[PDB]
Structure formats: C-alpha cells, structure tokens
RNA sequence: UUAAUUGCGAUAACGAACGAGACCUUAACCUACUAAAUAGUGGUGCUAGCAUUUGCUGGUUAUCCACUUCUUAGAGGGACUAUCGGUUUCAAGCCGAUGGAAGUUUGAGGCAAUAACAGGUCUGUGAUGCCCUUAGACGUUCUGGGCCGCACGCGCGCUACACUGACGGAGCCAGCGAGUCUAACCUUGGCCGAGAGGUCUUGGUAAUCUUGUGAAACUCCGUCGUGCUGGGGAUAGAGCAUUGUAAUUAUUGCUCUUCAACGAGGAAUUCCUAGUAAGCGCAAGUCAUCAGCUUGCGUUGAUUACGUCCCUGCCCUUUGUACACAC
C-alpha cells in the first residue's frame, strides 16, 4: 500500500564486478547475474549489508552497493559461516576463498590443467570432453557439444 | 461486477449461444473419406459448449498475466452477448459452416 | 537437432517497475470508470508491473476509491466506489 | 441419565463419530466449532444440513464430532453425514417419527448421500499397470 | 524369542524340509506324507506310510536312526523329538504313493501303458471318483511326447480342486 | 494369578474350538476372565514372478498366509492352570501361557 | 593356505544362498526363510502359503 | 462464556501471537537466524527473515496446546516437505532439527512449554493461560 | 446377464414337481423351506433356486 | 436369448463328462449375537486454563464404574435382479421405475478345459540323457579389472517446458505393511550440528513401540511477474558426512557455486468407461549402502460412449480353394 514516486536518480543498469548488472529487478535476483553469486549468497549479502531487499537494484546508493561488493569479496570478515563458500579449503593456499566473476573460470581452468598435467582420470576425461561424474555415456549426451 | 445480471444466467445463455446446432461426421465413401452434415443432440450441444468455453479460457490464460477466472469471465460474457471474438463462438460458426457446406 | 516446431518470437513487453508523478496521477484519475479492477487489468491498461499493481490496489482500497468484492490471494476483485 | 445418541458418518476411508446429546446448542468438531473445518468452501458444504432443516432444531441439542482417516474433503463429507444421522437418530429415539420422517425427507430430497454412505470403493491395482485399469505401454518394434 | 510370523514360516519350512527328506529316503516304503504336532514336553512326527515294518526295521532301528538324524540336524534335545509310524488307509487315494510305485515299476522296466493302466485301475477300484496319470518325455524316440491315461471324471477349476483333487 | 493364554495359529476353526473348550471349562470352574480377544488377522504376502526364467508376459503371483491370533486372560489358581496347560493340545495350533 | 577363501562374505549376495538349492540369485529374504523364488514357488503350499486372490 | 485456542482460527491466532512475541522481545533468538533455510528440502531462506522465528514459536506452541507432548522429530516431520530432488521424483524430507530444538528451548526459557514425562515437551499452565488470553484478544479484535 | 443355469432350473422344477402345495409365491418363505428341504452348499445358489421357484409359481398361477 | 454350446426350444438322436457358471478370497451393509486397558467411547474421582451461573477445552494408570456406536475379529443374516409397469413365440429373457448398503453374472480377482508351439529356461534346481573338460582343468578360490566402456539407432520411463504457476510462511489429513538372540533390526525422547548426520538413553519379537507413520498433492496468506524469468535443473568445480575391508570411472546424502537444452513436440503410436483415467505421495521387494524400477496401498478426482464392425483382430454358420511346414 506504500507508494512512493521515484525521482530521476534511478538507473536502468548498474556496473558491479566487471558485470553489467541489470536494473529493473529486485536486488538479490539482480546480483545473481554475477557469476559466482547465487541466490543464497546474494540474499545473505543483502542481509548483512542492511539494504531493503524489497528495493529494486537500479535505485540504490553507491555506498550501499560498494558495501555489498566489499562483503562479497571479503565474505568471512562479516560473520559468514565459511561453509557457504564455493571454494573452501583450496588445494594450495589452504584457506577458504570465494571465487567471483572471472576468477571462477580461471580457477576452474586451474584445477582442470592441474588434473591434466598429473594425468588424472578426470583430467583426461575433461581433455577428451567426456562425462566425468561416472554417468552412462552410451545413450545420453550424444549432442553434448 | 460486470454485466450486473445473474452470472449463472450469463453462463446458461452463453452455452445456449455457443451450442453447435449441426455438425459433420466422417463417412467412408470408398478410399476418399467424406464429410456428412448431421444434427447435434442437445446433450452434446451442452457438452461441446462447456468444452469449447473452458478450452478457450485455458488457452487464453496460458502464458499471460490474465488469470483463468477473469479469462473465463470475459469469454463467457462475449459468448453470451454473441461477438465472434469468443473462441467458442468462432469454433461454433466454423463447425456450422462446414456442416452447411457438406450438407 | 531437428525441432518439428516454429517457436516464433513475441513482443517482449516492458511493463513499468517504478512509478513517477504522471503515472501516479494517471492511475488516480482513471482507476475510476473501471467497472472491474484487478492486477491484470492494471497491468494491461497501464503497462505497470504486477508488484506495482498489487501495491496500488492496496493503496486505493486503503484510502477508499475501489471497493473490494473478494480479497483472495492470487485473485483480487475490486470495483469502483460510487 | 441424559438423552444422548451416538452415530457415525463414513467416506472412502474417513470416519466421523458424532455424539448428539441435549444441551445449549454447540456444534463442535475435534474440540473446535463447526465454522473452522478448513476447506472454507466445504465449510458451506457441511453447513448445508442444519441450514436446510433450520437452526431451531439445533437449539436444545449439542453435537461433538471426532473425525479420523481419509483426507480433508472426505472428512467433511463424513462430518455432514454424521451430524445428519445423529439428528435423525435423536428425533427417532426421543421425538416422534413425524419429525423424523419429514427431516429424512428433506435430507434425501436435497442429497441422497447425506444419510446413505456412498458405496464407491477403491478398486485394487492389478499387475502390469500403475492403476486398476491402465496398463503400462505396448511397444511392438 | 522369535516373532510369530517368523515362527510360523519356520515351522512351515521345517515341515517342508523333513517331508522332502522323508520322500527322498523312504520312497520304497510307500511314504505318503508326514504330520507334526508340537506339544508341551515333546514334538511328535507322525509318518504315514504303507510298509510300516520296513520303515521301522528290526526293533525300531530305522525309527531310532531317523530320530537321531532329525535331532542332530534341527538341534533338538534328545527325547524332545519323537517319531511314530502309521499304516495309512486308502492307499489308492494317495497321489504320491501311486506315483512312487509307478516310478519303481518303470525303473524295474515295466511298460508305461501297463503300469499306468494298472495304477489307474487300482485307484478306481479303491473308491475314487476319477483318476488321471500323465507320462511325459522321450518314449521310444528322441522326439518327446506326453501320453495320458484316465478313467472316471476329474475337475480342473475352483476351490473343489484344493478340496478333493490330490496331485 | 493373572495368566494369559495366547493362540497364534492359522487354522481358524481349530483355534476356535480350542478357545471354546477353554472358556467352557473356565465357566465350569466359574473363573473370572476377559474373554477371547481376537487380534487383527495379519496377512503375510509374498509377490513373485511365476516364471523361472525372464520371458513371457510379466505375470505376478501373490502367495499369502493368514495368521490368526487370540488371547484370553484368566485369574485361576495354579492347579487348574496346570490342568489347563495339560489339556487343549491341538495339531497345527501354537499356544503359549504367560503369568503376571 | 589361510588366504584361500579369505574374502569377507558378511553382506551382499555372496553372504546369502538358497537353503534348498544354494543359489545366489532370486533370494526371498522376507521373514527369514532364505529360499530362491523358484523353490519357494514349488514349496509354498507345504510351507503354508496359499493363493486366495 | 470462556474460550480456548480451539475456538479461534489458526492463522490469525498465530499471526497475533507472533506479533506479541516480537513485541515482547524476550524469546532468545539463536543468532544463526537469517542464515538458514529451515529445511534441507527447501531451497531459499524464509522471506520474512526478520520474523519467522516468532511464527515458528507460535505454531509449535499451538501444536503442543493441541497435542499431549511432541518432540523435535515430530516437529521436523510436521514442518518438512517435498524436496525437489532435481530430475528425480520428489520425496518427503524432515525439517531442520536445530530450529525446532532451539525454539523449544526458548519456549522453555520463557515458560510456555515444559519438559514432560514419557519424553517430549508439554504445554505448561502458564503457557496455557497466556495462550488463552491471547486467543481472547485475537477474537475480540473484531468487536 | 441374469440367465439362470440348468442346475437352478432343474432343481427348481423338481422342487415344484414334488413340493407344489407346500411352497408359495414368496421368496422368503420359499428360501426358508428350500434350505430345510434340500442340501445346497451355497446361500447364493439357494437364493437363486428359490427365486426361480417363485417365478415358476407365478407362471403356474397364470396357466 | 445370454458375458457364456448360457438357456428357451427345435430335433437320428438319447444320456453323460470337462470347460463356463457354480466355487473360494477380498471390498462394500449390520446402532442384531459373542466379546475386548494390545481398540475405543461416556461418566466418576484428582488436576490445568478460561469463564464463572450450571459450562467449554484438556490431562490423568492401577482413579474406578458402565458400554461396544465407531475399531477388531468369529458365528450368522442380507440380494434372488425382490416388487411394480412395459416388451418378447408372449418362453428363455430384456428395458424403466420404486425400495434397498448393494440391481453393469453387486465390484475386483484366484482357480481355470481339449489340442498344441519342434515358444522360453540345461544361468533356479544334488532335475537331467548325450557330448566336452577333469589337475600348468572349463572345478574351486585369491588379487585387480570388466559387466557402466561411446560416432550413433531404437524401447520402458523420470523431470519439465510455468501464474490452474515457482518460492516462503503457516494450516494440516491416509491406507497397505515391516521390524533385533545369540543378533545386533524399526527407532521414540534429550543433547550437539546450517545441513547431512553424530552421541546418551528408551520402547518394541510387536492392534501394545517405532507410528496418529502429523506422507505429498493440497488449502489460506504473502513475495514474484510473462522476462528461458525467482521456470527448468542437466553439465561441472570445491568442501562436509554416512555405508563398507575397500567408493579413484564422483555408492549415496548434504552445503555453496556453475545454471545447458526445453518456448506443448512431425510422420506415427499407447492406455483407458468409474471412485476408473489422470495427478499425488507412502510402504514392501531386491538391500551393508544405492530407485528415476516393480508389487501393493491409500489421497484428490475429470471429460466422453452406454455404441459400431470402418481399421485391427476374435467366435459360430454357410460358401470357394490348385493351400496341409496350411496366404
Ligand atoms: Mg495466465
Ligand atoms: Mg493411479
Ligand atoms: Mg509446510
Ligand atoms: Mg510432478
Ligand atoms: Mg477424566
Ligand atoms: Mg414382470
Ligand atoms: Mg467375478
Ligand atoms: Mg529347467
Ligand atoms: Mg547390464
Ligand atoms: Mg516392461
Ligand atoms: Mg506452497
Ligand atoms: Mg493410521
Ligand atoms: Mg527453480
Ligand atoms: Mg493398437
Ligand atoms: Mg527400497
Ligand atoms: Mg549398484
Ligand atoms: Mg529391477
Ligand atoms: Mg471359386
Ligand atoms: Mg499339398
Ligand atoms: Mg502372397
Ligand atoms: Zn532354491
């Protein structure tokens, strides 16, 4: 029932983490556009940054969004339970990270080339392009590429 | 709220408006299957009216913001008036035209 | 990969998500003369979102411009108050 | 003692026992009044017997219903059959049979299944198919 | 300390096992079934055969060794399991006795028609309503075929088959 | 003395005549008793394929075994209890007595 | 040698076998009878299972 | 006349009691709230994130008022649902045990529910009296 | 269909041959004397025979 | 005429038999019998809350008393197309209505003839003839693989392609069943853990305990909003657990992230007439662990016929045949 006439400060797009985050949709589902940021992570970040999750993304302040990306790129510093993290207990650094927009692809390629250079079975499977999780490949995934 | 008479009066005169009076059947004839125009029983008139109305409401409410209730409402209203924009009315005149051609 | 279908494109509508003064006083002036008012009616006649339609419905029935007939979820039925 | 009967309504698997005694006119179901039976349209469907025979015949009698089994609408049908059978049984035992037979006439004129339980029962599932009749699928080539 | 379901299927498989055992060794004694009665202080096994002197042996030696065998196999206490023999009546009205007599006649080398007609004549003389014996397999040729020998009338469908027909 | 007799058989008329001669002996001795409470018959079902091999029509077969259970509660001294468990031995019917 | 037949048979189909025919496939482990389905079909009448419906 | 929880509808009663509990503010919310999904079969956290714990508390309070005694497993089965298991068919999955256990401990702390013989939690007389008073208030709203 | 077999028809007409003055035009009394006067394994078969005897008595009353 | 060589009848046939039917099981009815703290109900005590003016909603095992309506069974009864009206040589029967719990042989099954297939199975069988092998064995056992391997083609299915909707809160209802002894089964409750799960105990050899299996679909409030979108959840990466001797070609489960085709499906083609189709989940089977499978159960519950021989076939009679491994 609470209507408010918005002003000209709305922006139909906004730019976060080298990704063209769409405006005109609610902020948590808009932040899911960032690759590496899903619904749970985006919802918890919008909660920890103390933004109104009912607000649209295109009408949000610069300080609110930079607080959001700070909480994103430094997750555990703001009381994040460290099992939400998609890259936890990594193989070299040993500490829990959370990869983001292009670091997800780069780190995926890093573990793939690690497996390929140690000639592990999953690495050879990925190099051939076959299924690696032990699925049957006789009938499904015919036009997988 | 629209058409402030009895809404059940609207649905009964809708099914009388969209009841198909004559319809065609599929006879063999030899090789080429033919159409033959026969008349429709009143029970099948009611049944075909109900099926046409709800099918039109369903396919018009599919994949859009208009709910099935209000879609069925406007379909029933247009059928009760007689409008040629109702799905059931269009199907009715098509079936009666094919019957009249294959008399 | 054969399809056996057409899959023709559509209009890709651009319903409004935030309101301004012109849309606000537009709805304030033309939600009367609507005999039957609902979320989809507002969406089709004003090109606004469903969220704006719901909030505007609650607003107008709170002040009293539209009368509720049935306020069920997923289907709200409002008339004009005369 | 107190004038009191107990009857029962049934459905597919829902049963509803109804104790009808003399009281001040309270119609409870599972300790809750009849206005809260929670399909809220079948609320009207369970209102309809007492709405038919008028609330004057419920002023001096109170009904308490305990319902088990089935689903929601099955329980509602069991409730309405139970209260109809309880009212007509009270009017059979204590009141004369004229009231009993006109009440039963009104009930069965509106709906047969208000007093007579429906005899449709689940048909067992046969092998070679998911249901009682439907088979799986015939493939030839 | 066993559930009743498992107890009842246990005595079922126990009866079936000892019946298979008895029809394996007591074939040349006309073994025509067995019955069990569990009882406070003892369980008894009533064998119903024809040659009771042969299933007993000299002074019950074969009954003694059979009791010892079933006791050793089923881990019963010595004395808690007892066996009795019984000369069964109506030998013609017993499908297994006629079947094993047919088997022994054919193993001795009798003709199949003579043996089957003799046994069906014996059963019909024994007061049966109808008897019916089928011999299947390779008879005089590599190609197999089933021969049928019947007398009287027999039924095939219904609860009367469980009630009356012994097979 | 609070004894319970439980019959756990499959032959229903054998169990029934056992229970009837039990209760008429009990009322002949004018003993107090909760009568024969008949528990729900429990059906043991086993569904299999009829064929030993795999081919044919997928025809299934359900072999069942009904189990009937009754219990009678008695208050009666040890000597009439001992002749009660001495007697009522039926073939194919399993009985057991518990005290307290 | 001791190693011969060393492998555990505490579970799986190698732990069970038909009490009548020593078959591993098709076991009926219901109610602890442990008969293959074919031998059960033969012996069900004298076990005490019957067909009523 | 006298009323009870059975004399009022469940939804508005739970709404009123949850609002009263949020206004009272002596419930001892856990702290890991606003992080969880309430069910392994769910896929999103509750949408009323600042609330929903007073709602769950009111619901289990009414549930224990109705029943004799319940446990956290009974509550997990009650609040569990159909988990969309991706491409495989659905299945019932019990809810989060920690949420129900901590709200039960919190209701013990505030004094609505108590521990019970025969195991579980039973509605105490204090919880009974104030649930009845809240029912009185929530059906006398409309007068 | 409700066609009755020759066992029912033959037992019914035999009952009518040797018990015509005893039995009457009511199914209940015909049943209550049929179970007394013959041994039938089935209540269903007894009811079928009694119904056909009552039908044939109705036939006898008209020619 | 019947669902039916089911019957009425006709009659070089008469009298019979098997099959069908009859039969048995199950589902429906019984306020009629027997009963029952291992099923309930009412009252009485003791006790909680509100109203207090009697009351309403509850709890209570050694508080008893009473009963069996609901629940379980056992013994029976009940329907036979009963009555009536039509129609039929006016017979078998058929149609409609009334009554009735039930009027499609009441519904669903089980059993189910003769003759055969050169159907399948020697990988169920210490059922087997013959042939092969029988000791660096084709026996048996151990280690490790494989039965999953993927350019492709088909058959059962499961998820879906969205607002008759997804998600989040509440509301909140089944039935069929299974479960540990010399073993370690179904697990309640308490606590820890986001979760999966773990730990301390407890009940149950079971109408008693798991379990009212508080199932899901559903309902009500909201959020979303016609956007391959908060649909859809494949393909992947990382981590945490459980089973097991052992999980690497991930056993499964859980968390986060990744977020593809799919916009209702061409020629074709399957199943189905009422509590049936369809939707929805649950139990059991296999099972140390693993359901997208099967066997059953219940929950919600439509539309359209009440016919025809056009297609696909089936039964009987007549007819033609150059067919007999038989179009
Ligand atoms: Mg729509
Ligand atoms: Mg189904
Ligand atoms: Mg829920
Ligand atoms: Mg689905
Ligand atoms: Mg009391
Ligand atoms: Mg007549
Ligand atoms: Mg039948
Ligand atoms: Mg073989
Ligand atoms: Mg394979
Ligand atoms: Mg198949
Ligand atoms: Mg929902
Ligand atoms: Mg139950
Ligand atoms: Mg989704
Ligand atoms: Mg076909
Ligand atoms: Mg399983
Ligand atoms: Mg496996
Ligand atoms: Mg399988
Ligand atoms: Mg010719
Ligand atoms: Mg020739
Ligand atoms: Mg040709
Ligand atoms: Zn075997």
From Swiss-Prot, chain A:
Gene3D superfamilies: 1.10.8.50, 30s ribosomal protein s13, domain 2
Main location: cytoplasm
Spans through the membrane: none
Disulfide bonds: none
Modified residues (N-acetylserine): 1
UniProt subcellular location: Cytoplasm
GO MF term list: rRNA binding; structural constituent of ribosome
Cellular component terms (Gene Ontology): cytoplasm; cytosol; cytosolic small ribosomal subunit; mitochondrion; small ribosomal subunit
N6-methyllysine sites (modified residues): 47
InterPro entries assigned to the protein according to its UniProt record, in alphabetical order: Rbsml_uS13_C, Ribosomal_uS13, Ribosomal_uS13-like_H2TH, Ribosomal_uS13_CS
Annotated GO biological process: cytoplasmic translation; endonucleolytic cleavage in ITS1 to separate SSU-rRNA from 5.8S rRNA and LSU-rRNA from tricistronic rRNA transcript (SSU-rRNA, 5.8S rRNA, LSU-rRNA); ribosomal subunit export from nucleus
Pfam families noted in UniProt: Ribosomal_S13
Chain positions of cross-link Glycyl lysine isopeptide (Lys-Gly) (interchain with G-Cter in ubiquitin): 35, 48, 79, 95
Post-translational modification remark: N-terminally acetylated by acetyltransferase NatA.
Biological role stated in the UniProt entry: Component of the ribosome, a large ribonucleoprotein complex responsible for the synthesis of proteins in the cell. The small ribosomal subunit (SSU) binds messenger RNAs (mRNAs) and translates the encoded message by selecting cognate aminoacyl-transfer RNA (tRNA) molecules. The large subunit (LSU) contains the ribosomal catalytic site termed the peptidyl transferase center (PTC), which catalyzes the formation of peptide bonds, thereby polymerizing the amino acids delivered by tRNAs into a polypeptide chain.
Other comments on record: Present with 48100 molecules/cell in log phase SD medium. There are 2 genes for uS13 in yeast.
Entry protein name: Small ribosomal subunit protein uS13A
Gene: RPS18A
UniProtKB/Swiss-Prot annotation, chain C:
Membrane among keywords: no
An example Gene Ontology molecular-function term: structural constituent of ribosome
Protein's GO biological process: cytoplasmic translation
Any one cellular-component term (Gene Ontology): cytosol
Compartments in which it is found: Cytoplasm
UniProt entry tagged with the keyword Nucleus: no
Domain of life where this protein originates: Eukaryota
Keywords linked to the UniProt accession: Cytoplasm, Methylation, Ribonucleoprotein, Ribosomal protein
Location (main, coarse): cytoplasm
Listed Basic residues bias regions: 1-7
Function as written in the Swiss-Prot or TrEMBL entry: Component of the ribosome, a large ribonucleoprotein complex responsible for the synthesis of proteins in the cell. The small ribosomal subunit (SSU) binds messenger RNAs (mRNAs) and translates the encoded message by selecting cognate aminoacyl-transfer RNA (tRNA) molecules. The large subunit (LSU) contains the ribosomal catalytic site termed the peptidyl transferase center (PTC), which catalyzes the formation of peptide bonds, thereby polymerizing the amino acids delivered by tRNAs into a polypeptide chain.
Similarity comment: Belongs to the eukaryotic ribosomal protein eS25 family.
Further facts: It is presumed that the precursor part of S25 is engaged in assembling of the small subunit, thus being essential in ribosome maturation. Present with 322000 molecules/cell in log phase SD medium.
Protein name: Small ribosomal subunit protein eS25A
Portion of the full sequence shown: 24 to 105 of 108
From Swiss-Prot, chain E:
PTM annotation (Phosphothreonine): residues: 41, 67
KH type-2 domain location: 18-89
Domain of life: Eukaryota
Segments traversing the membrane: none
Location(s) in or outside the cell: Cytoplasm
Secretion signal, residue range per the UniProt entry: none
Sites of Omega-N-methylarginine modification: 143
Glycyl lysine isopeptide (Lys-Gly) (interchain with G-Cter in ubiquitin), cross-linked positions: 103, 129, 138, 148
Principal cellular location given in the protein's record: cytoplasm
Keywords on record: Cytoplasm, Isopeptide bond, Methylation, Phosphoprotein, Ribonucleoprotein, Ribosomal protein, RNA-binding, Ubl conjugation
GO MF annotation list: DNA-(apurinic or apyrimidinic site) endonuclease activity; RNA binding; structural constituent of ribosome
GO CC entries: 90S preribosome; cytoplasm; cytosol; cytosolic small ribosomal subunit; nucleus; preribosome, small subunit precursor
Entry's family note: Belongs to the universal ribosomal protein uS3 family.
Note: Present with 146000 molecules/cell in log phase SD medium.
Name this protein carries in UniProt: Small ribosomal subunit protein uS3
Portion held of the full protein: 4 to 170 of 240
Curated annotation (Swiss-Prot), chain F:
Record flagged with keyword Cytoplasm: yes
Keywords, in A-Z order: Acetylation, Cytoplasm, Isopeptide bond, Ribonucleoprotein, Ribosomal protein, Ubl conjugation
GO cellular component: cytoplasm; cytosol; cytosolic small ribosomal subunit
GO molecular function, one term: structural constituent of ribosome
Any one of the GO BP annotations: maturation of SSU-rRNA from tricistronic rRNA transcript (SSU-rRNA, 5.8S rRNA, LSU-rRNA)
Covalent cross-link site, Glycyl lysine isopeptide (Lys-Gly) (interchain with G-Cter in ubiquitin): 2, 13, 82
Key word Flavoprotein present: no
Main location: cytoplasm
PTM characteristics: N-terminally acetylated by acetyltransferase NatA. Also partially acetylated by NatC.
Subcellular location: Cytoplasm
Coiled-coil ranges per UniProt: none
Similarity field: Belongs to the universal ribosomal protein uS10 family.
UniProt subunit comment: Component of the small ribosomal subunit (SSU). Mature yeast ribosomes consist of a small (40S) and a large (60S) subunit. The 40S small subunit contains 1 molecule of ribosomal RNA (18S rRNA) and 33 different proteins (encoded by 57 genes). The large 60S subunit contains 3 rRNA molecules (25S, 5.8S and 5S rRNA) and 46 different proteins (encoded by 81 genes).
Name of the protein in its database record: Small ribosomal subunit protein uS10
Organism: Saccharomyces cerevisiae (strain ATCC 204508 / S288c) (Baker's yeast)
Portion of the parent chain present: 20 to 119 of 121
């Amino acid at each position: 029932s609470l209507v408010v006439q918005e002003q000209g400060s709305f922006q139909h797009i906004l730019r976060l983490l080298n990704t063209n985050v769409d405006g005109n949709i609610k902020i948590v589902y808009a932040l899911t556009t960032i690759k590496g940021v899903g619904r749970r992570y985006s919802n918890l970040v919008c909660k920890k940054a103390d933004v109104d999750l009912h607000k649209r993304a295109g009408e949000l302040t610069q300080e609110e969004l930079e607080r959001i990306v700070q909480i994103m790129q430094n997750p555990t510093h703001y009381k994040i339970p460290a099992w939400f993290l998609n890259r936890q207990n990594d193989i070299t650094d040993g500490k829990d990270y959370h990869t983001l927009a292009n670091n997800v692809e780069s780190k995926l390629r890093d573990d793939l080339e690690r497996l390929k250079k140690i000639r592990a079975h999953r690495g050879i499977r990925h190099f051939w392009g076959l299924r690696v999780r032990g699925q049957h490949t006789k009938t499904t995934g015919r036009r997988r590429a | 709220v629209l058409t402030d008479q009895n809404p059940i009066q609207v649905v009964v005169d809708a099914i009388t408006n969209t009841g198909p009076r004559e319809d065609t059947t599929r006879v063999g004839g030899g090789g080429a299957a033919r159409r033959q125009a026969v008349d429709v029983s009143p029970l099948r008139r009611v049944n075909q009216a109900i099926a046409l109305l709800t099918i039109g409401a369903r396919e018009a409410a599919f994949r859009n913001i208009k709910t099935i209730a209000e879609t069925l409402a406007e379909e029933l209203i247009n059928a009760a008036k007689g409008s040629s924009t109702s799905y059931a009315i269009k199907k009715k005149d098509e079936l009666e035209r094919v019957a009249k051609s294959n008399r | 990969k054969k399809k056996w279908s057409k899959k023709s494109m559509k209009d890709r509508a651009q319903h409004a998500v935030i309101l301004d003064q012109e849309k606000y006083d537009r709805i304030l002036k033309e939600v009367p003369t609507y005999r039957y008012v609902s979320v989809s009616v507002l969406v089709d006649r004003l090109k606004i979102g469903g969220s704006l339609a719901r909030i505007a419905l609650r607003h107008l029935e709170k002040e009293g411009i539209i009368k509720p007939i049935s306020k069920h979820s997923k289907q709200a039925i409002y008339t004009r108050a005369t | 003692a107190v004038p009191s009967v107990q009857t029962f309504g049934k459905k597919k698997s829902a049963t509803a026992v109804a104790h009808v005694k003399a009281g001040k006119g309270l119609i409870k179901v599972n300790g809750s009044p009849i206005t809260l039976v929670e399909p809220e349209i079948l609320r009207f469907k369970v209102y309809e017997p007492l709405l038919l025979v008028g609330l004057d015949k419920f002023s001096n009698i109170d009904i308490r219903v305990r319902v088990t089994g089935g689903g929601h609408v099955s329980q509602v049908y069991a409730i309405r059959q139970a209260i109809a059978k309880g009212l007509v049984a009270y009017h059979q035992k204590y009141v004369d049979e004229q009231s009993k037979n006109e009440l039963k006439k009104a009930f069965t004129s509106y709906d047969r299944t208000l007093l007579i339980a429906d005899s449709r029962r689940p048909e067992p599932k046969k092998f070679g198919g998911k249901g009682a009749r439907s088979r799986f699928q015939k493939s030839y080539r | 300390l066993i559930s009743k379901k498992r107890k009842l299927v246990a005595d079922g498989v126990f009866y079936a096992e000892l019946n298979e055992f008895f029809t394996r060794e007591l074939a040349e004694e006309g073994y025509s079934g067995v019955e069990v009665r569990v009882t406070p202080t003892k369980t008894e096994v009533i064998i119903r055969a024809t040659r009771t002197q042969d299933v007993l042996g000299e002074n019950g030696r074969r009954i003694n060794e059979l009791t010892l065998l079933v006791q050793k196999r089923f881990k019963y206490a010595p004395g808690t399991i007892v066996l009795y023999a019984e000369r069964v009546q109506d030998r013609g009205l017993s499908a297994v006795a006629q079947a094993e007599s047919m088997k022994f006649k054919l193993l001795n080398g009798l003709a199949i028609r003579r043996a089957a007609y003799g046994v069906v004549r014996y059963v019909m003389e024994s007061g049966a309503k109808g008897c019916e014996v089928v011999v299947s397999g390779k008879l005089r040729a590599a190609r197999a075929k089933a021969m049928k020998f019947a007398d009287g009338f027999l039924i095939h469908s219904g609860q009367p088959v469980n009630d009356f027909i012994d097979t | 003395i609070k004894i319970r007799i439980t019959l756990t058989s499959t032959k229903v008329k054998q169990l029934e005549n056992v229970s009837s001669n039990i209760v008429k002996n009990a009322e002949q001795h004018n003993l107090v008793k909760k009568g024969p409470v008949r528990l729900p018959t429990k059906v043991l079902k086993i569904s299999t394929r009829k064929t030993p091999n795999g081919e044919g029509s997928k025809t299934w077969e359900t072999y069942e075994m009904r189990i009937h259970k009754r219990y009678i509660d008695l208050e009666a001294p040890v000597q009439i209890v001992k002749r009660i468990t001495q007697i009522t031995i039926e073939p194919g019917v399993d009985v057991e007595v518990v005290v307290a | 040698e001791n190693v011969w037949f060393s492998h555990p048979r505490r579970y799986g189909k190698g732990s069970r076998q038909c009490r009548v025919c020593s078959s591993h496939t098709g076991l009926i482990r219901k109610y602890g009878l442990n008969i293959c389905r074919q031998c059960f079909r033969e012996k069900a009448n004298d076990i005490g299972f019957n067909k009523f419906r | 006349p006298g009323v009870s929880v059975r004399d009022v509808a469940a939804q508005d009663f739970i709404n009123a009691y949850a609002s009263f509990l949020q206004r009272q503010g002596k419930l001892e919310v856990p702290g890991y709230v606003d992080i969880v999904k309430t069910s392994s079969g769910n896929e999103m956290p509750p949408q009323d994130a600042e609330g929903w714990f007073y709602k769950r508390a009111a619901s289990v309070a009414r549930h224990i008022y109705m029943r004799k005694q319940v446990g956290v497993g009974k509550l997990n089965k009650l609040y569990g649902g159909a988990k969309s298991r991706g491409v495989r068919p659905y299945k019932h999955i019990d809810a989060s045990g920690s949420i129900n256990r901590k709200v039960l401990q919190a209701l013990e702390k505030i004094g609505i529910v108590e521990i019970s013989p025969k195991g579980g939690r039973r509605i105490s007389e204090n919880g009974q009296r104030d649930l009845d008073r809240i029912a009185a208030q929530t059906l006398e709203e409309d007068e | 269909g409700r066609v009755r077999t020759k066992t029912v028809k033959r037992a019914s007409k035999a009952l009518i041959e040797r018990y015509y003055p005893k039995l009457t035009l009511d199914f209940q009394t015909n049943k209550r004397l049929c179970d007394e006067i013959a041994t039938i394994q089935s209540k269903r078969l007894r009811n079928k025979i009694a119904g056909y005897t009552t039908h044939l008595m109705k036939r006898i009353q008209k020619g």
